[PDB]
Amino acid sequence: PTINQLVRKGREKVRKKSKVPALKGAPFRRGVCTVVRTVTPKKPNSALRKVAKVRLTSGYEVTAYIPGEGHNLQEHSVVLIRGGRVKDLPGVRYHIVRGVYDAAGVKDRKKSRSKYGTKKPKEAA
Amino acid sequence: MLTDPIADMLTRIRNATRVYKESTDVPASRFKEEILRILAREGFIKGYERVDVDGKPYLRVYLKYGPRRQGPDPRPEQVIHHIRRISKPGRRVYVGVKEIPRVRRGLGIAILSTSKGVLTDREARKLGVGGELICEVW
RNA sequence: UGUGGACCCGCCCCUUGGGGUGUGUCCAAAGGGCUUUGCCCGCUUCCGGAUGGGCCCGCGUCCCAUCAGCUAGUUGGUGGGGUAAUGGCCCACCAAGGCGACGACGGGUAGCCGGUCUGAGAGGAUGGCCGGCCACAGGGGCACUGAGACACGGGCCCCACUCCUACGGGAGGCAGCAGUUAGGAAUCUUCCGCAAUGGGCGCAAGCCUGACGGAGCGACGCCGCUUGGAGGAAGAAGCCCUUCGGGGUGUAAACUCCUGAACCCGGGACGAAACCCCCGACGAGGGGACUGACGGUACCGGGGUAAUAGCGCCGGCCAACUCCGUGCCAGCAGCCGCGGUAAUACGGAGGGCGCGAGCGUUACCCGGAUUCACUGGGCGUAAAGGGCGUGUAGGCGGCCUGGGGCGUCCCAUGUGAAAGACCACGGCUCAACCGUGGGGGAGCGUGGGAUACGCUCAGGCUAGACGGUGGGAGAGGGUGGUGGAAUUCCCGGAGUAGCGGUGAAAUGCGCAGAUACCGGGAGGAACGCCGAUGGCGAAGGCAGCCACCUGGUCCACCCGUGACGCUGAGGCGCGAAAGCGUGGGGAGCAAACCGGAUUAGAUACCCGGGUAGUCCACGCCCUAAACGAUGCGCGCUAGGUCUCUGGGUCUCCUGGGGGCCGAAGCUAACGCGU
RNA sequence: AGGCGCCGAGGGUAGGGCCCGUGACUGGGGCGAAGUCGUAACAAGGUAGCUGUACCGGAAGGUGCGGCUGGAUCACCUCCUUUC
RNA sequence: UGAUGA
RNA sequence: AUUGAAGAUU
Ligand SMILES: NC[C@@H]1O[C@H](O[C@H]2[C@@H](O)[C@H](O[C@@H]3[C@@H](O)[C@H](N)C[C@H](N)[C@H]3O[C@H]3O[C@H](CO)[C@@H](O)[C@H](O)[C@H]3N)O[C@@H]2CO)[C@H](N)[C@@H](O)[C@@H]1O
Ligand SMILES: [Mg+2]
Ligand SMILES: [Mg+2]
Ligand SMILES: [Mg+2]
Ligand SMILES: [Mg+2]
């Protein structure tokens, strides 16, 4: 644009949008479950994926992924939510933190133990 | 109407050299002359002189090149590699002495107009004055 | 009493209510202690200082124009009132004004800054701790007192809440330190001390001080430190790989010596010398004493134990590979993507990479992102030229000379607090942290200077633009008129059995005689050949011929004016087709629709009919593959060839259009290319 | 002292404008390996396509009018290129 | 006139 | 049963 033009209109600040209304910015939100459905992925993916409908302290009600081997969640389960889409499941944009509230940690977990929320086990250790 | 005469000159010059012309008229103005003097002195042009064409004052500018050149494409190097307007009617550009640019670590010039007259950048810097930054040239 | 000060009037200097002066008028005071006639603490008037503040002004300060008009104390005035003081701050009266595309008004969001984070920088983001300013003290009013408040722990009233109530009435306000509860992903002790610093009152001794100086909780952050050091096999076991030879964990362990975090014993701070008292003189100066929350802590000396490792990752980006399990499952997943019976990508295991009292995850900010491009981007086909003009504001402006000096540039000077930042040297054993010193600095104010460029004023020129005279080409537009070819119908003639239509057919029309043929008539619409690779117009668009009304434009002459220029937000006008309204018209064509075929079906392609519409006048609509998908103007940069239209000295030369090929150059390419 | 008055937080009734809520009924839209109907489009896509508009039809669409090439194939042409 | 997902 | 594996097919 001419320079007069920039004096007239100026450039416009590219201000862009959140991917995670875990509202008040907040790094995590507390919710209570509602469904604990299973969902089919899309794309070229086939499987039965674990999901909860979560009613939030945000005021918001949304779907969240339940990561790891197997869970222990049902209707009234009460859980912490973290954000992290699933990407195979369009419309799933939050994960459930495992090992907080009524969500068990992953039993029998040796490797990426810190996610999945499972304490240092004792064997020869 | 022709809206930036000094742009014009720089361009006439830029244009004539890329087809290796020996010379170009440009319609004459005192200011244009002052810029030419620098070009001449700094060794970018051979020289220049006043002349008429259709009986109106012009300025023949004698341009200057390198030697005929090595292999496929024998075109001489240019002496005036780059000649660019900085200040323009759209956007006037002025510098204080502390902020006059250094063109191509000194291997280049920046003509620049002051209330002590038109000067290369070293010239201006020495007489510790700034002004309208006319064009760079390297 | 009147040093003096206040006020009215005058006069002088000075210049907004600043000094000075003269009548007149008006206005002061408080006592206390004593080491008691002479000192200490006070009181009163006034002039100054110092510090702290009020008020005003230039400039700067976020998002939305899908917020465009706003405003009655409104804008100004005269006279009051009110204040410490200016002011519609408030009031009476008069005037009719003020503000806004340079964004008024309205909506949203927000305490501002010093700074902070990020970035090469320009910039972006931000304003927690610390320092400065502002505003608020349950929400809303309001004044009192005072040098100062319209007062967080003062007052009054209204409201909402909680508490007491003998039901009339009352009490109250942690956004002070702790602490409780609620909300939340989440944020501390109902600690110790006035020892230091600082504050209030007091002559002092002192008292008050949840300011503060410390300690406590939390890996929340930064910095320092430990979980050992040297030996120690061709190399235990176990575990893992294995072409069954072996290879790996691995000097790692074991084991030898050595040192000695922790822990124990002994000593033990600086931070604190003042106030005060004595001497001197209640001064200067000298002497003396009291005082430590932190704390039996830091630090010093002695003794002394081998004494904690975790988390993430190993398909590519990205450093790190193997065996099982699993079979599009269970699962992974920042993006690309892994898994369907041989998975370095899932889960486990060996081994490996990375970091280490941490490591990862999520959220958020800057980066990379020249991905809003000022630095530093683009629009023929990628997203992007406005459908075209006209011209308003605005932006931009040829050549010469002079004034001015606004922009711009230079010198001096003031300002830019401290913290922070950067550099030095210092103190804690280092560092973090801290002290001291030095050096930057835009922006703004003042004084002086320059004048090239920009601006402005005044003059001047003719190269831009406009005009004059003379010539030209054109489907440029408007109005009236007229011409022939064809189709349809109507009338007459002659004439007989089909015509029409298709891939083939049928619907249809024909003996009320159609088709074909000849003559006459009516009507509507469109203009064959010329016709072009042609012309005209800003676009849409414009085509028989004739007249009239009218737009643009090209050439020659070099005659006039003297920069009168370019572009153009908004406005206004034009704008193909189809469509809308009113009134006409209606030949041919033809959405819809009615039939005939076709087809698996055929709401279609083909065939026979047919209304709107196509046509005219007037008024709307305002769209498009409104295209060169290429905004407008000007200057510059090889040529060749075809063409329309001028001029010349007419091989040619020279203008203005239309084309193609293509120097230089440009482009992602295709292409573009006077 | 007390009284009256102006102003005045706030409240009321009428009248507009505006924001949140919820909402019976209702319109589409995005996304989801292997459901149904046809076959519009891409080759001349088997009626060249696209387009503004207008009517119509389960659906893609079809047709009318005008426009565009951002259309295949054959011709006559003239341009370019080619010489010569 | 049609030719199921990777 | 079929397929690389599935959907679909008996
Ligand atoms: N997507 C917007 C419009 O949506 C429509 O798409 C929607 C449906 O029409 C389309 O349906 C397809 C169907 O076309 C196709 N012929 C058969 C197929 N099973 C369907 O599939 C759809 O529905 C199935 C459930 O059966 C889901 O598995 C699948 O995610 C989805 N693609 O799937 C879309 C919903 O996913 C148009 N077909 C689409 O082309 C158009 O763009
Ligand atoms: Mg770009
Ligand atoms: Mg485009
Ligand atoms: Mg297929
Ligand atoms: Mg698959």
Nearest to B30 by CA among B113, B132, B130: B113
Tokens of B116: 């002590």
CATH of domain B81-138: 3.30.1490.10
Would you give the distance in Å from CA B41 to the centre of its chain?
Answer: 11
- Sequence-distant (6+) residues with CB within 8 A of A89 are A39, A41, A42, A49, A51, A65
The closest nt to A87, taking CA to C1', is: C333
Identify residue A103 by its one-letter amino acid code.
A
CA pair distance B83, B23, nearest whole angstrom: 16
Total residue length of chain B: 138
- Domain boundaries defined on chain B: 3-80, 81-138
Tokens of A88: 């195979």
Whether the Cβ atoms of residue A3 and residue A26 lie closer than 8 Å to each other: no
For B107, which DSSP code?
Answer: T
Nearest C-alpha of chain B: how many angstroms from A2? 8
User: Resolution reached, in Å?
Assistant: 3.1
Total residue length of chain A: 125
Query: Using CB atoms within 10 A of its CB, is residue A77 exposed (0-12), middle (13-18) or buried (19+)?
Result: buried
Would you identify the CATH topology of the domain B3-80?
Ribosomal Protein S8; Chain: A, domain 1 (3.30.1370)
Give the strand order in the sheet containing B112-114: B94-95, B131-132, B112-114, B117-119
CA pair distance B11, B83, nearest whole angstrom: 8
Does residue B90 belong to the interface with chain A, where contact is any CB pair within 8 Å? yes
CA pair distance A98, A110, nearest whole angstrom: 15
CA pair distance A107, A38, nearest whole angstrom: 20
The closest nt to A44, taking CA to C1', is: E6
Residues of A in contact with B90 (CB under 8 A): 2-4
Experimental method: X-ray
Query: Using CB atoms within 10 A of its CB, is residue B132 exposed (0-12), middle (13-18) or buried (19+)?
Result: middle
Domains of chain A: 1-125 (2.40.50.140)
Cα of first residue to Cα of last residue in chain B, in angstroms, is: 29
**What is the Å distance from ligand 2's center to A68 Cα?**
44
